Design an enzyme around this catalytic site. Structure first.
Site, PDB file in Angstrom:
ATOM      1  N   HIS A  67       0.810  -1.214   0.000  1.00  0.00           N
ATOM      2  CA  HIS A  67       0.000   0.000   0.000  1.00  0.00           C
ATOM      3  C   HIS A  67       0.842   1.262   0.000  1.00  0.00           C
ATOM      4  O   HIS A  67       0.323   2.340  -0.212  1.00  0.00           O
ATOM      5  CB  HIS A  67      -0.960   0.007   1.214  1.00  0.00           C
ATOM      6  N   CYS A 174       2.561   6.521   2.881  1.00  0.00           N
ATOM      7  CA  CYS A 174       2.295   5.937   4.207  1.00  0.00           C
ATOM      8  C   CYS A 174       3.253   6.393   5.302  1.00  0.00           C
ATOM      9  O   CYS A 174       3.068   7.450   5.902  1.00  0.00           O
ATOM     10  CB  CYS A 174       2.269   4.405   4.165  1.00  0.00           C
TER      11      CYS A 174
HETATM   12  N1  LIG Z   1      -2.113   4.926  11.823  1.00  0.00           N
HETATM   13  C1  LIG Z   1      -1.620   4.811  10.582  1.00  0.00           C
HETATM   14  O1  LIG Z   1      -2.074   5.361   9.580  1.00  0.00           O
HETATM   15  C2  LIG Z   1      -0.389   3.944  10.395  1.00  0.00           C
HETATM   16  C3  LIG Z   1       0.397   4.120   9.252  1.00  0.00           C
HETATM   17  C4  LIG Z   1       1.539   3.352   9.064  1.00  0.00           C
HETATM   18  C5  LIG Z   1       1.902   2.393  10.000  1.00  0.00           C
HETATM   19  N2  LIG Z   1       1.085   2.213  11.136  1.00  0.00           N
HETATM   20  C6  LIG Z   1       1.402   1.239  12.179  1.00  0.00           C
HETATM   21  O2  LIG Z   1       2.425   1.948  12.905  1.00  0.00           O
HETATM   22  C7  LIG Z   1       3.341   0.979  13.447  1.00  0.00           C
HETATM   23  C8  LIG Z   1       4.776   1.324  13.064  1.00  0.00           C
HETATM   24  O3  LIG Z   1       5.158   0.927  11.724  1.00  0.00           O
HETATM   25  P1  LIG Z   1       6.669   1.077  11.248  1.00  0.00           P
HETATM   26  O4  LIG Z   1       6.567   0.748   9.807  1.00  0.00           O
HETATM   27  O5  LIG Z   1       7.382   2.287  11.675  1.00  0.00           O
HETATM   28  O6  LIG Z   1       7.234  -0.175  12.034  1.00  0.00           O
HETATM   29  P2  LIG Z   1       8.660  -0.766  12.483  1.00  0.00           P
HETATM   30  O7  LIG Z   1       8.392  -2.172  12.767  1.00  0.00           O
HETATM   31  O8  LIG Z   1       9.627  -0.282  11.498  1.00  0.00           O
HETATM   32  O9  LIG Z   1       9.063  -0.040  13.828  1.00  0.00           O
HETATM   33  C9  LIG Z   1       8.533  -0.587  15.044  1.00  0.00           C
HETATM   34  C10 LIG Z   1       9.538  -0.237  16.111  1.00  0.00           C
HETATM   35  O10 LIG Z   1       9.068  -0.318  17.462  1.00  0.00           O
HETATM   36  C11 LIG Z   1      10.006  -1.042  18.248  1.00  0.00           C
HETATM   37  N3  LIG Z   1       9.467  -1.711  19.457  1.00  0.00           N
HETATM   38  C12 LIG Z   1       8.888  -2.926  19.464  1.00  0.00           C
HETATM   39  N4  LIG Z   1       8.476  -3.299  20.680  1.00  0.00           N
HETATM   40  C13 LIG Z   1       8.842  -2.250  21.416  1.00  0.00           C
HETATM   41  C14 LIG Z   1       8.617  -2.189  22.781  1.00  0.00           C
HETATM   42  N5  LIG Z   1       8.048  -3.216  23.402  1.00  0.00           N
HETATM   43  N6  LIG Z   1       9.038  -1.072  23.392  1.00  0.00           N
HETATM   44  C15 LIG Z   1       9.640  -0.072  22.731  1.00  0.00           C
HETATM   45  N7  LIG Z   1       9.855  -0.154  21.404  1.00  0.00           N
HETATM   46  C16 LIG Z   1       9.459  -1.249  20.708  1.00  0.00           C
HETATM   47  C17 LIG Z   1      10.779  -1.916  17.271  1.00  0.00           C
HETATM   48  O11 LIG Z   1      12.116  -2.112  17.764  1.00  0.00           O
HETATM   49  C18 LIG Z   1      10.799  -1.074  16.008  1.00  0.00           C
HETATM   50  O12 LIG Z   1      11.979  -0.301  15.814  1.00  0.00           O
HETATM   51  C19 LIG Z   1       2.844  -0.368  12.975  1.00  0.00           C
HETATM   52  O13 LIG Z   1       1.952  -0.947  13.933  1.00  0.00           O
HETATM   53  C20 LIG Z   1       2.029  -0.056  11.720  1.00  0.00           C
HETATM   54  O14 LIG Z   1       1.082  -1.117  11.503  1.00  0.00           O
HETATM   55  C21 LIG Z   1      -0.055   2.985  11.341  1.00  0.00           C
HETATM   56 ZN   LIG Z   2       1.603   1.554   6.164  1.00  0.00          ZN
END
Ligand SMILES: NC(=O)c1ccc[n+]([C@@H]2O[C@H](COP(=O)([O-])OP(=O)(O)OC[C@H]3O[C@@H](n4cnc5c(N)ncnc54)[C@H](O)[C@@H]3O)[C@@H](O)[C@H]2O)c1
Ligand SMILES: [Zn+2]
Ligand SMILES: NC(=O)c1ccc[n+]([C@@H]2O[C@H](COP(=O)([O-])OP(=O)(O)OC[C@H]3O[C@@H](n4cnc5c(N)ncnc54)[C@H](O)[C@@H]3O)[C@@H](O)[C@H]2O)c1
Ligand SMILES: [Zn+2]
Ligand SMILES: [Zn+2]
Ligand SMILES: [Zn+2]
Lengths: 374, 374
Positions: A67, A174
């Site tokens: 996406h 995104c």
């Molecule tokens: N609301 C929206 O429109 C939207 C848009 C994009 C992504 N998201 C969501 O946002 C989130 C982030 O996506 P991303 O692509 O940056 O992900 P990512 O996986 O790259 O980053 C996640 C990070 O959080 C860390 N983490 C994990 N557990 C942790 C903990 N227990 N304590 C502290 N830190 C911790 C990981 O080490 C990692 O660096 C995902 O859940 C995704 O589904 C939401």
């Molecule tokens: Zn996304």
């Protein structure tokens, strides 16, 4: 040529949950009335794409996930007036029909024509444009960018600058816009404030850029993976803290550091515990906490309503609060104006074929954003 | 004269939970530096006072409850400058020290010197000014207005108009300001909006007054006691619903009524479930919910974070968001200027000695606000 004809090409199909992506040959039907067929150029791997695989984000399977992308218009169906063939575009996983109550509202952005609330995994008309092995494959958020060609409705696409470096700008579809918007748009970070960001992935680092752009004086990055700390600081974080380094809960540490709690906190991971912890670490009387992370399907969190009574504000947001079709072209123009940097988010660039490897880099923590080139 | 001497008078003391108030004699020590002794003229019975009795709101017992009232300054301690003997004043259960982090923030009002978060049940200096049967008695929210005389710190008292009718403006010390400010200041109700208010009591009816003033086009009142509806309509409610009349959950009913959800919702009951119900009925992408009701001690609510991800805003507030010392005088001045009316709230007026029947009227559902006169 291809216009009006069925096209055969390679797409990454997910047949089962927790199984690798199968690079297959699929038949992409032509765009119907108000649809657009797009030739993919670059597509980022976002953690939400990984939530589908893990069964975290339920959407009808089999499906062609993806996406976060950028491509070029191949053909347009009857009635299309916003794009024409050869136009560089970014598909919108959050549409902007322009006619529902949300689109008409000056602030809502979560258009009712979205397929995230109750995933049908089809086109607006309820049918699929994808066939593999004679079996119909589902769409994902009306985008499905893990395909050389994809078909999206007009409400789910935006035309962008002709000189746009598609392999960089795809992030605006995104990760970036989400994090950047959550900060400047949703939370409304104030100059001089103290912010805390839980999760330093691609979206989390973008929240840090938003906060820094908004004038935050202090930005505390929090992550259990200390390797993420250099990039965070690189993009704006004043300090980073790793929860496992402490004998006492992180909300307590954050409260002490900020002398009572942060002004704005963001949950950018997707865990029920970090969502409550993020709410708890912001100042009780006037602190704002924004949930950016997508929570695991069908699970409820537990919290003490007193955290709110005292005066905290808890919000959530899709796509950073931006009305997709209006804002996407704009962000690209701002990127072109050199108003913000996307490079620090891109850590790996691999061929579409190496899709499963890009995911392996995410799951292991080696990458921020991996772009798949077609 | 009484200046500088211990005053023996009557006060309603709560010795045990779930027990009647004991109207008896207590000694009221004179005010120390920066404290003020006040003679109570009128005091309202708020549901929060009953929460203490039921143990819903935990504060050290034995105590002299009461926090919504008005009276006249009897004597001032050393260094008092903001009030003088003979002044009409309203005791602030939410202080305004003016020096702390919250007081100096342009939006916050929950002063750090409050005794609501970590109730000690004493003065700012850790000591009590009440003695009954030789035993020390606790203060409540630094106000303890269910007494003929009470001592408060300067930060917990606001001088009001010398011509103010104390038997009416006492409701400004809590019930009115709370509900009113929740609508106009906290939720910031917009012109033309649809609002829903769960709980049609003194505080809820006041919320409706705030919505009306803010221009709400539609204001639905929800209560299981249909007797409350007539007064609700009377103060602004366009329509009222009783959850018990429907076979399907009220958030569904409310959502269908407002074609996809309300703009603003208010929980003015104090129940965990209605707090969740209130959030759910507001529009998913731009709806705002405000928690006004005091929840049961140490009890957590369970909710799905997607309710917030789609875009909802969830917040709570103490005293309508009003910086107590600042707001109270202005609100009394507006009352005088006839900007709003307090009369619809007052259903019963009783002498202080009848305090127990006043509480029974609250529990039977027969009253809105009973004012107690000294
Ligand atoms: N609301 C929206 O429109 C939207 C848009 C994009 C992504 N998201 C969501 O946002 C989130 C982030 O996506 P991303 O692509 O940056 O992900 P990512 O996986 O790259 O980053 C996640 C990070 O959080 C860390 N983490 C994990 N557990 C942790 C903990 N227990 N304590 C502290 N830190 C911790 C990981 O080490 C990692 O660096 C995902 O859940 C995704 O589904 C939401
Ligand atoms: Zn996304
Ligand atoms: N946040 C603050 O600063 C603040 C200030 C004052 C009062 N309060 C609180 O606000 C709440 C209301 O106070 P009040 O003085 O108006 O009380 P009240 O008892 O007069 O009103 C409660 C109302 O809710 C109704 N109700 C009960 N159960 C219901 C249900 N299941 N569904 C729908 N309606 C229901 C009751 O019939 C009643 O009409 C209390 O919990 C009180 O402690 C908070
Ligand atoms: Zn729409
Ligand atoms: Zn009260
Ligand atoms: Zn203060």
């Amino acid at each position: 040529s291809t216009a009006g004809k069925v096209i055969k090409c390679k797409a990454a199909v997910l047949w089962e949950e927790k199984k690798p992506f199968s690079i297959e040959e699929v038949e992409v039907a032509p765009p119907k009335a108000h649809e657009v067929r797009i030739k993919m150029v670059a597509t980022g791997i976002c953690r939400s794409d990984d939530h589908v695989v893990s069964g975290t984000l339920v959407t009808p399977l089999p499906v062609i996930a993806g996406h976060e992308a950028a491509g070029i218009v191949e053909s347009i169906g009857e009635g299309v007036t916003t794009v024409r063939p050869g136009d560089k575009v970014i598909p919108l996983w959050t549409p902007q029909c322009g006619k529902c109550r949300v689109c008409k509202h000056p602030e809502g952005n979560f258009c009712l024509k979205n397929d995230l609330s109750m995933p049908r995994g089809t086109m607006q008309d309820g049918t699929s444009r994808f066939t593999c092995r004679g079996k119909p494959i589902h769409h994902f958020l009306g985008t499905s960018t893990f395909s050389q060609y994809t078909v999206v409705d007009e409400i789910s696409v935006a035309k962008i600058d002709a000189a746009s470096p598609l392999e960089k700008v795809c992030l605006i579809g995104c990760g970036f816009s989400t994090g950047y918007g959550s900060a400047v748009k949703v939370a409304k970070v104030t100059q001089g404030s103290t912010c805390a960001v839980f999760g330093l992935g691609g979206v989390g680092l973008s929240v840090i850029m938003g906060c820094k752009a908004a004038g935050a004086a202090r930005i505390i990055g929090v992550d259990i993976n200390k390797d993420k700390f250099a990039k965070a600081k690189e993009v704006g974080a004043t300090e980073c803290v790793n929860p496992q380094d402490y004998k006492k809960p992180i909300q307590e540490v954050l409260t002490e550091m900020s002398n009572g709690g942060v002004d704005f906190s963001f949950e950018v991971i997707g865990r029920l515990d970090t969502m409550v912890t993020a709410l708890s670490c912001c100042q009780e009387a006037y602190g704002v906490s924004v949930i950016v992370g997508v929570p695991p399907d069908s699970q409820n969190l537990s919290m003490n309503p007193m955290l709110l009574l005292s005066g905290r504000t808890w919000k959530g947001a899709i796509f950073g609060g931006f009305k997709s079709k209006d804002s996407v072209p704009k962000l690209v123009a701002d990127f072109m104006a050199k108003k913000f940097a996307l490079d620090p988010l891109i850590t790996h660039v691999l061929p579409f074929e190496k899709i499963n490897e890009g995911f392996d880099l995410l799951r292991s923590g080696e990458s921020i954003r991996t772009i798949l080139t077609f």
